[PDB]
Amino acid sequence: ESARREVESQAQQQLERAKHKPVAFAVRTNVSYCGVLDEECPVQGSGVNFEAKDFLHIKEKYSNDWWIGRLVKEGGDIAFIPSPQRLESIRLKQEQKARRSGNPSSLSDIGNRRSPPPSLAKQKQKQAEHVPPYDVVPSMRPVVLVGPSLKGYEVTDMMQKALFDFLKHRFDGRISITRVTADLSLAKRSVLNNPGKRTIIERSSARSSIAEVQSEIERIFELAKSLQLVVLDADTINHPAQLAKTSLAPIIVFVKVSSPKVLQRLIRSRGKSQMKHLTVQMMAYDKLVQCPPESFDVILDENQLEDACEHLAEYLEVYWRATH
Amino acid sequence: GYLDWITQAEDIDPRWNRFCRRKCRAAVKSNVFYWLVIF
């Protein structure tokens, strides 16, 4: 069979002529599927088994089954990623390997009730949620600042003020810091076919902020498209949990101040503008410290401005180096 | 290390005073002022 030999290198030549192809978009994966067990691919060999929460930058359009993308690790190369449907089709095969995949138990009952798999045993059902294996993510992971207390307060606005100042000087020509004053808590990947398309509807959502909530989502989306570092520092982010399920999936930087006693004298020295809500700062840290450590992407517990700055700057260039 | 960290935030323009404070603050932490005062 000489047909396979020509098509095997047909992709090899197409994806090698232009090693500066623009990144069309990026996708995220969270399914433990082995691409080497199933010997089926445009280029035979050993495919890359990108694990959960690994970004793949799909920059080409081959067909409806497999797509070409690059990973976000250092020394990334050109790889292939099958379609989500294809993954849905091949995930259904995973339960096919068992003796039974529907209702009928095989507990010494064969030949009496065949019970072929009905539409309830296929992917047609489970449409109430039907969470897709693949989710839309921006070109690069946005970075937002949380902690060591609730945003908008004196110290918390002060800690980010010095931190964001360092990024623009160190990353001049590669970064863009923006400020958005609109809410972001109510932002899910699938809530309606067209949320608030018309503002003249005059309904429960027409007069709300949803008319402009969706507009800024593309603004962050278009900011990442221009190949630059984006910074989101809104007043509506106070915990990584609520933003861990949106489309953005950003980077969370943690500036933990270790013992809660420190925070106290940090706010006590400010002025009379602080003790009007002095006590809530403790529960502001308390409601934020209980989050599991693995949710945070980086930790900055250092007590010096300089050491924490170089700690974060070193991580961003690695992200910058990997995605280039 | 935290009182000066928030003080470093005050030195950033969002007045000539903050420019004045910023220059003098880094002047102390210069490794030359320390040897000058030692001398």
Swiss-Prot record, chain A:
Record region (Disordered): 92-133
GO terms under cellular component: cytosol; L-type voltage-gated calcium channel complex; membrane; synapse; voltage-gated calcium channel complex
Known tissue expression: Expressed mostly in brain, colon and ovary.
Residues bearing the modification Phosphoserine: 115
UniProt keyword annotation of Calcium present: yes
One of the GO BP terms on file: chemical synaptic transmission
Keyword Ion transport carried by entry: yes
Domain of life of the native organism: Eukaryota
Subcellular localization(s) per the UniProt record: Cytoplasm
Primary subcellular site in the record, as a coarse category: cytoplasm
Family according to the record: Belongs to the calcium channel beta subunit family.
Function of the protein: Regulatory subunit of the voltage-gated calcium channel that gives rise to L-type calcium currents. Increases CACNA1B peak calcium current and shifts the voltage dependencies of channel activation and inactivation. Increases CACNA1C peak calcium current and shifts the voltage dependencies of channel activation and inactivation.
Protein name according to UniProt: Voltage-dependent L-type calcium channel subunit beta-3
Source organism (scientific name): Homo sapiens (Human)
Whole-protein residues included: 38 to 361 of 484
Curated annotation (Swiss-Prot), chain B:
Subunit comment: Component of a calcium channel complex consisting of a pore-forming alpha subunit (CACNA1C) and ancillary beta, gamma and delta subunits. The channel complex contains alpha, beta, gamma and delta subunits in a 1:1:1:1 ratio, i.e. it contains only one of each type of subunit. CACNA1C channel activity is modulated by ancillary subunits, such as CACNB1, CACNB2, CACNB3, CACNA2D1 and CACNA2D4. Interacts with the gamma subunits CACNG4, CACNG6, CACNG7 and CACNG8. Interacts with CACNB1. Interacts with CACNB2. Identified in a complex with CACNA2D4 and CACNB3. Interacts with CACNB3. (Microbial infection) Interacts with influenzavirus H1 hemagglutinin.
Tissue: Detected throughout the brain, including hippocampus, cerebellum and amygdala, throughout the heart and vascular system, including ductus arteriosus, in urinary bladder, and in retina and sclera in the eye. Expressed in brain, heart, jejunum, ovary, pancreatic beta-cells and vascular smooth muscle. Overall expression is reduced in atherosclerotic vascular smooth muscle.
Subcellular location: Cell membrane; Cell membrane, Sarcolemma; Perikaryon; Postsynaptic density membrane
Function: Pore-forming, alpha-1C subunit of the voltage-gated calcium channel that gives rise to L-type calcium currents. Mediates influx of calcium ions into the cytoplasm, and thereby triggers calcium release from the sarcoplasm. Plays an important role in excitation-contraction coupling in the heart. Required for normal heart development and normal regulation of heart rhythm. Required for normal contraction of smooth muscle cells in blood vessels and in the intestine. Essential for normal blood pressure regulation via its role in the contraction of arterial smooth muscle cells. (Microbial infection) Acts as a receptor for Influenzavirus. May play a critical role in allowing virus entry when sialylated and expressed on lung tissues.
Written domain comment of the UniProt record: Each of the four internal repeats contains five hydrophobic transmembrane segments (S1, S2, S3, S5, S6) and one positively charged transmembrane segment (S4). S4 segments probably represent the voltage-sensor and are characterized by a series of positively charged amino acids at every third position.
Superkingdom per UniProt: Eukaryota
Family classification: Belongs to the calcium channel alpha-1 subunit (TC 1.A.1.11) family. CACNA1C subfamily.
Name by which UniProt lists this protein: Voltage-dependent L-type calcium channel subunit alpha-1C
PTM characteristics: Elevated levels of blood glucose lead to increased phosphorylation by PKA.
